[PDB]
Amino acid sequence: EIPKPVAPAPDILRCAYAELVVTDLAKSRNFYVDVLGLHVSYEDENQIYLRSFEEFIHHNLVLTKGPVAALKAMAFRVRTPEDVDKAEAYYQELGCRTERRKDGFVKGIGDALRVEDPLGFPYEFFFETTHVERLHMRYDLYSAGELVRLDHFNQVTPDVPRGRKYLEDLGFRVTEDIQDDEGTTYAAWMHRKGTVNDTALTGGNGPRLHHVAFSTHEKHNIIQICDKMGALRISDRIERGPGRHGVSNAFYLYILDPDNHRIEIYTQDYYTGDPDNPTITWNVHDNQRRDWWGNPVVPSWYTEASKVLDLDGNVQEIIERTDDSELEVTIGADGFSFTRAGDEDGSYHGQASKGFKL
Amino acid sequence: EIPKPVAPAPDILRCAYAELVVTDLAKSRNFYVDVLGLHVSYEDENQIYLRSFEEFIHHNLVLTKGPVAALKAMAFRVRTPEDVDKAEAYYQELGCRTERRKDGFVKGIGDALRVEDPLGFPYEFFFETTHVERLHMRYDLYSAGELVRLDHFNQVTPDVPRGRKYLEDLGFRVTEDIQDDEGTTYAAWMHRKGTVNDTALTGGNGPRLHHVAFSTHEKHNIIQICDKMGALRISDRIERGPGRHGVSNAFYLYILDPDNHRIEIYTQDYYTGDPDNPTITWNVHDNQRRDWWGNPVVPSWYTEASKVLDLDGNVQEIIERTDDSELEVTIGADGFSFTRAGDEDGSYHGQASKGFK
Amino acid sequence: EIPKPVAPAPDILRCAYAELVVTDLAKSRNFYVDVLGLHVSYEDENQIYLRSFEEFIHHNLVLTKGPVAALKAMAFRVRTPEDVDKAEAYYQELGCRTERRKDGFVKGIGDALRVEDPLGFPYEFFFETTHVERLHMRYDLYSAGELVRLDHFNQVTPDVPRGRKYLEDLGFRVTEDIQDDEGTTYAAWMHRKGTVNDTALTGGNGPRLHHVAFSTHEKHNIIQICDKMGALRISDRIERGPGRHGVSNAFYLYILDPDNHRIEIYTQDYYTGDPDNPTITWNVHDNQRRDWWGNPVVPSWYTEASKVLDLDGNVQEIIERTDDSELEVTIGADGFSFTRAGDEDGSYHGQASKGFKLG
Amino acid sequence: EIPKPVAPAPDILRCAYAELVVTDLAKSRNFYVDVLGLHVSYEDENQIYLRSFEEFIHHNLVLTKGPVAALKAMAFRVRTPEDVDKAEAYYQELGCRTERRKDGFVKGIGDALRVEDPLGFPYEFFFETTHVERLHMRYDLYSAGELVRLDHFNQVTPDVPRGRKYLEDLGFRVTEDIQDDEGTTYAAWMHRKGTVNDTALTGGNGPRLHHVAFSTHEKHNIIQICDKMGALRISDRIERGPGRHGVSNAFYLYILDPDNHRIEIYTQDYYTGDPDNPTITWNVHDNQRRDWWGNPVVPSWYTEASKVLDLDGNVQEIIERTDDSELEVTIGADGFSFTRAGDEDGSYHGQASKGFKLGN
Numbered sequence A: 001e002i003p004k005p006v007a008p009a010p011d012i013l014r015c016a017y018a019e020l021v022v023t024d025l026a027k028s029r030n031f032y033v034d035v036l037g038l039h040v041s042y043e044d045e046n047q048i049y050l051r052s053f054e055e056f057i058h059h060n061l062v063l064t065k066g067p068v069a070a071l072k073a074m075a076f077r078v079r080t081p082e083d084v085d086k087a088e089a090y091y092q093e094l095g096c097r098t099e100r101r102k103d104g105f106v107k108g109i110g111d112a113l114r115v116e117d118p119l120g121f122p123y124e125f126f127f128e129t130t131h132v133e134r135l136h137m138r139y140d141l142y143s144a145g146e147l148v149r150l151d152h153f154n155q156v157t158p159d160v161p162r163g164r165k166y167l168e169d170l171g172f173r174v175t176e177d178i179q180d181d182e183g184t185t186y187a188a189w190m191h192r193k194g195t196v197n198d199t200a201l202t203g204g205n206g207p208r209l210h211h212v213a214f215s216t217h218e219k220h221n222i223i224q225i226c227d228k229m230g231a232l233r234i235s236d237r238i239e240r241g242p243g244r245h246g247v248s249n250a251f252y253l254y255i256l257d258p259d260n261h262r263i264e265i266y267t268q269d270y271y272t273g274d275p276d277n278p279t280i281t282w283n284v285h286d287n288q289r290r291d292w293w294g295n296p297v298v299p300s301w302y303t304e305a306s307k308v309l310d311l312d313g314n315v316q317e318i319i320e321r322t323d324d325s326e327l328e329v330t331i332g333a334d335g336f337s338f339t340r341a342g343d344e345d346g347s348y349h350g351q352a353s354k355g356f357k358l
Numbered sequence B: 001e002i003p004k005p006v007a008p009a010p011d012i013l014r015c016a017y018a019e020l021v022v023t024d025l026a027k028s029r030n031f032y033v034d035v036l037g038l039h040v041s042y043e044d045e046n047q048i049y050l051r052s053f054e055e056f057i058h059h060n061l062v063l064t065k066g067p068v069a070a071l072k073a074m075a076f077r078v079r080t081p082e083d084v085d086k087a088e089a090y091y092q093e094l095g096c097r098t099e100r101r102k103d104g105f106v107k108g109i110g111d112a113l114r115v116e117d118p119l120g121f122p123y124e125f126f127f128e129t130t131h132v133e134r135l136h137m138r139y140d141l142y143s144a145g146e147l148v149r150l151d152h153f154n155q156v157t158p159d160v161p162r163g164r165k166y167l168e169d170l171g172f173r174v175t176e177d178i179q180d181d182e183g184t185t186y187a188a189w190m191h192r193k194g195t196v197n198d199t200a201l202t203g204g205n206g207p208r209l210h211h212v213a214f215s216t217h218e219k220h221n222i223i224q225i226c227d228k229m230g231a232l233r234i235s236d237r238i239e240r241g242p243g244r245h246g247v248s249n250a251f252y253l254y255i256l257d258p259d260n261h262r263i264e265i266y267t268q269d270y271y272t273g274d275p276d277n278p279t280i281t282w283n284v285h286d287n288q289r290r291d292w293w294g295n296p297v298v299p300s301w302y303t304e305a306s307k308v309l310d311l312d313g314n315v316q317e318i319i320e321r322t323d324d325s326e327l328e329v330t331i332g333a334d335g336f337s338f339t340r341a342g343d344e345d346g347s348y349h350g351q352a353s354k355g356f357k
Numbered sequence C: 001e002i003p004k005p006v007a008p009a010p011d012i013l014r015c016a017y018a019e020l021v022v023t024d025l026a027k028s029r030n031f032y033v034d035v036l037g038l039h040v041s042y043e044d045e046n047q048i049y050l051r052s053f054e055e056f057i058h059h060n061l062v063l064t065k066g067p068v069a070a071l072k073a074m075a076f077r078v079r080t081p082e083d084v085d086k087a088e089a090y091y092q093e094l095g096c097r098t099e100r101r102k103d104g105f106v107k108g109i110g111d112a113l114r115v116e117d118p119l120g121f122p123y124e125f126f127f128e129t130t131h132v133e134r135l136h137m138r139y140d141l142y143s144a145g146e147l148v149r150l151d152h153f154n155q156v157t158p159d160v161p162r163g164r165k166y167l168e169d170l171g172f173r174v175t176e177d178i179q180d181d182e183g184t185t186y187a188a189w190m191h192r193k194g195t196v197n198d199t200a201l202t203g204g205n206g207p208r209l210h211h212v213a214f215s216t217h218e219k220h221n222i223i224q225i226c227d228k229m230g231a232l233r234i235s236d237r238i239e240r241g242p243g244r245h246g247v248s249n250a251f252y253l254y255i256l257d258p259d260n261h262r263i264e265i266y267t268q269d270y271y272t273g274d275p276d277n278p279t280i281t282w283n284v285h286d287n288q289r290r291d292w293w294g295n296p297v298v299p300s301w302y303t304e305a306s307k308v309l310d311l312d313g314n315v316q317e318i319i320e321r322t323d324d325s326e327l328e329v330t331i332g333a334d335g336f337s338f339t340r341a342g343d344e345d346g347s348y349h350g351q352a353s354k355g356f357k358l359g
Numbered sequence D: 001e002i003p004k005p006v007a008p009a010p011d012i013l014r015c016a017y018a019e020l021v022v023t024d025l026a027k028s029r030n031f032y033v034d035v036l037g038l039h040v041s042y043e044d045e046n047q048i049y050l051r052s053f054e055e056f057i058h059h060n061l062v063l064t065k066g067p068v069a070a071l072k073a074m075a076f077r078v079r080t081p082e083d084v085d086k087a088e089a090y091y092q093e094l095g096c097r098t099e100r101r102k103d104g105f106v107k108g109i110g111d112a113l114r115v116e117d118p119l120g121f122p123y124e125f126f127f128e129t130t131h132v133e134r135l136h137m138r139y140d141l142y143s144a145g146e147l148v149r150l151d152h153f154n155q156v157t158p159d160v161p162r163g164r165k166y167l168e169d170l171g172f173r174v175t176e177d178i179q180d181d182e183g184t185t186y187a188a189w190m191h192r193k194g195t196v197n198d199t200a201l202t203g204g205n206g207p208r209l210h211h212v213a214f215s216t217h218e219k220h221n222i223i224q225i226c227d228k229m230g231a232l233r234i235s236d237r238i239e240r241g242p243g244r245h246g247v248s249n250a251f252y253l254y255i256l257d258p259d260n261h262r263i264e265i266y267t268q269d270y271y272t273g274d275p276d277n278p279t280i281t282w283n284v285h286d287n288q289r290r291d292w293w294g295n296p297v298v299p300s301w302y303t304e305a306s307k308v309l310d311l312d313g314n315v316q317e318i319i320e321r322t323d324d325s326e327l328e329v330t331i332g333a334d335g336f337s338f339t340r341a342g343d344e345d346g347s348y349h350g351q352a353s354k355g356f357k358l359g360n
């Protein structure tokens, strides 16, 4: 288990931005700007800094050209400059590698701490950021698929309980999770800002980044992204969805960028900010837990995820999950899922729902 | 080939209602009234008469208790009372069995003709119907999933060109179809009322009724139906969707009633009323023709459909399709589909899209 | 009274396009293309030809540069080439001035007949038109405010029953109307294509063109047009709405182009194609008849409308309405409206709803 | 000026519920339940306890029968039981009257403090509450107009800067405000939970309660409430909207309950939780500030608001505003409003936008 430091945890406000390494900056720009409509805060020949429609901080997404596509940092904003000091002391006590730069790692961010966290992920903590024009009423720019906020990250890690304890000590509260009747945890979601999540853990080989999620205002905005991708004849880059989530209750869609980084589009989860917010636990065999409508979860969603980098820019070695696999127990050859607990009708043995096999 | 009568075709306005035989009336009522929110026009111990939010004719759906679930009649409204006489002469010349009831077959319909049509389907033609309160501004009754109009039927039949020519003679205009390069037709959509379809032909063993479709105002109304079915823990009765259609461009969902009758929910297709409305042909291997987003079509959509009855209420014998199977050529072991024509990236060989066999 | 000809009426399919004269073509282009997102079929220094997202005929709107902003033609497509000949005979029997051009008045239209109709309006009838790429699945182009179809026209004319009868003889069927208890008709809506209207008559001094209406898919598309106009700091060009209509049950908005031509954005009216479609008559004092939510009807809606041209391009003289004014009887100083018939609560006397009088 | 106490402010989570006094409990139930679709947690002959679709605390609204319709309490939930003690000490240092009930003022709330705050408003602070079934995935119950959360309160008070400083010391952050070029503040919005507001101050005679706001998921849910009010032939109870706000950028509607308590329906404001969230100041003469589309603000919006009670249940005396009136300076006789700053075209002199004047 990861011990709880004597040192006070930093006060984390929210997920704020991700830095993604991409291999072809122009192809990535085309996806994130021309297809998805994100707004350019700054760009040059090496990097593109993008923000959502309602953001005032410098960016939500940095695309950095590099040789290997990977997550380089997932950044959380802290409440005060002094919280960056707290973050540094906290991670030093945990025995984690840290690097602090008073003028930031990327443009538009000031004093920042990056760490290789106990699960192998590159976390950044910062307060100082360059404010930009908040585009929230720029309806002259508004896309029919407009991405309005950064919502969350989702991480793949082999041991969910181990990770969950560490994030709870850091101040995240678990909102929903997935378990079985045999003591296995498959996933958990946890928050600071009072939505279902700021980061989440998905059981699997890791460290890998499962996805970065952006919000829309309404469900039709998500539909429009799918319609546009059909019109562009890139529907093969729609991985899963659209649907209603069980966990989170949000309307959702998963798409893949040119380097196969998975982006979720997400809307209309619920308020979690009360400290006794009731925690919802689903059974892993409940076929409405991921897609509420019982639509099958494609195996690539379980198996594929992005590499992550260490502070030297090198790919982190992947550690294999030894706990049961959600894929195997639900849609594999010996898998099972149900629609109604205890009802054989609407249950699936050794295959996925709605008529499909792997 | 089905010859064109010399008798003038009835002037058909639109699809108007279906009569479905159901085995358990209370269970069926629960689905159509309590789940789907259709409005009761009349009921007793034997039948439930239901209508959509914007309808003024007596009903769009009649549920009739019987021993074997099946389509008993698919009904079209005609322009004038004299068009029922035309329909009778027309089908008599075709050599079809007909039955005329001057006082109707079901409540709220007057003078009506039922026929066993040349494709084996029980069609009704009528003009006279009891007007009821049009609920189109009754927002005090409006459901988050409200079904606002009856939109179309879809029929499974073995020989699509044969059926298409028969429907064209009857005045239906083809709007869209699916074909391959060898010249096989897999499906056609055709209309009277100036939408993408009033009835449609799906290639397969028939006569069987593929579905009845109702429209909503907006796409979120369809999402709500899915969400409601999840809450009621009957998500297993969501067969396919929700999705954007390629053919028709409509947003869609397919669900199954307690007797496995398939209901489509549908919104936002386009205007087809001009006589030179451009006809759209899709290639059968195009993975965006059915679901525009490339989601796979579940095999049950191609294989399962409702029995239909003859005028004595016995189940109509089925004729097997001998033309190529859309299932087999797209998602079966020797099938294939593409995202971009001529591109192996985003193509699927011997399985369906998105990772599924 | 306008007589019914012996000659058969042409079979009219639908409203198809309007030709509007505009005074500054670049300013008008900015409005219809950059603000509203209509699609250009053809343009030059003299004209801009525009279509909606789902259209396959050549255009829904022609902007023609000229000295005096006005309606030059409201055009209906007919079912067959021969229906143009029927239109010509029909209007010649009515004693109307007609002009026939075998190769069209505007680009992308073939054989066409323009008439100065018995109410002074320039109608066009045509069958032949150049087909274009139907953009209905071009979601790479789709705007958050996308205009998907042309829906209808609305005409201001002093004597509504006189015009209604003439349109009925032409095959248009009345769907809804607005009357009072003492027999005055204020407005009527009438269709060919199976929606609430293809053209409509608003009582007032005329001939003038009240508006041209385009459809969206959903209500939020209309909300976006408002939002965008706020962002562009042209909210003063939002005239009325958005709202829910009583008559038609459609969600709506009225906006003004650079020459004050009024454009309606409209969605989700109901099917009227059955021949016994039930007609709906509203009382003029029913404050839910126009805006169903009871929001006040802005006075310019009742007073302002576009000039129309005759076949020489000169403005048609205006004839004054002598029947009662809807403005006056509902929101003027002697006006009244109700929420519930017979209830003083929720009634308005000498002013509009929601606490406003006329400015 | 209201001094900053030495005692630490309670840690406030969010607005949580209001208790409104109503004169006819059945008529009020018809409005909030049958019209608006709120969910009944408990009721009897004297009270109705209601909650929104996504709520897990016992209620968001208590309707209490009494002789005079009024706000009885606006309630904020605090982070810990100990914050109720902090609240008591804080308000005692402010010199305010307070009342502490270990088992609650209303059913489903435990240990609770009510205070007559420095602006004369009855605030409640509590932590303990009975959890109920959270209905957030009960789509079998979901209405076409479903109210999904309680969002905020809005208070009418004569001196906005005085109130603003007090609420800032209590830890609310101002997100937007309306001012003019001559030093007057007409309104301010302020939050704890990371939306545009939890409570707000509107300049006017007070203390009075301007509104309680509930949110929906989507704009069409707000359209449906209007549509249903039309079908029920109660469109006279739609006061203002629907619209897009300038302040907050939310889609909105204002409606009136049977006692004229004003309810806002609200959706799709933006995230404010960062501590340096940019404060937006609108000029009072900007005609897109309140309705972004420039629709005129109905005069009753500026003049009418609910009475509020003291801790004895008596109506609080009203103190008149002496600062300039937003109504007067925008749509009154000497009013002015603009569409584009510095452009005469689209400006309005001595009347409202869109062709309207103030009714007599």
Ligand SMILES: O=C(O)Cc1ccc(O)c(O)c1
Pocket (backbone or CB within 6 Å): B154, B213, B245, B246, B247, B248, B264, B266, B289, B290, B291
């Ligand atoms: O299978 C598909 O998705 C094509 C399709 C289009 C329109 C319809 O009404 C329908 O039932 C089926």
Ligand SMILES: O=C(O)Cc1ccc(O)c(O)c1
Pocket (backbone or CB within 6 Å): C154, C213, C245, C246, C247, C248, C250, C264, C266, C289, C290, C291
């Ligand atoms: O004024 C109103 O609100 C009534 C009305 C209904 C339908 C329309 O198309 C229209 O232009 C006007």
Ligand SMILES: [Ca+2]
Pocket (backbone or CB within 6 Å): D180, D181, D182
């Ligand atoms: Ca001043």
Ligand SMILES: [Cl-]
Pocket (backbone or CB within 6 Å): A245, A247, A289, A290, A291
């Ligand atoms: Cl999921």
Ligand SMILES: [Cl-]
Pocket (backbone or CB within 6 Å): D245, D247, D289, D290, D291
């Ligand atoms: Cl406001």
Ligand SMILES: [Fe+2]
Pocket (backbone or CB within 6 Å): A152, A153, A154, A211, A213, A264
């Ligand atoms: Fe996610």
Ligand SMILES: [Fe+2]
Pocket (backbone or CB within 6 Å): B152, B153, B154, B211, B213, B264
């Ligand atoms: Fe269909």
Ligand SMILES: [Fe+2]
Pocket (backbone or CB within 6 Å): C152, C153, C154, C211, C213, C264
């Ligand atoms: Fe109109």
Ligand SMILES: [Fe+2]
Pocket (backbone or CB within 6 Å): D152, D153, D154, D211, D213, D264
């Ligand atoms: Fe408010």
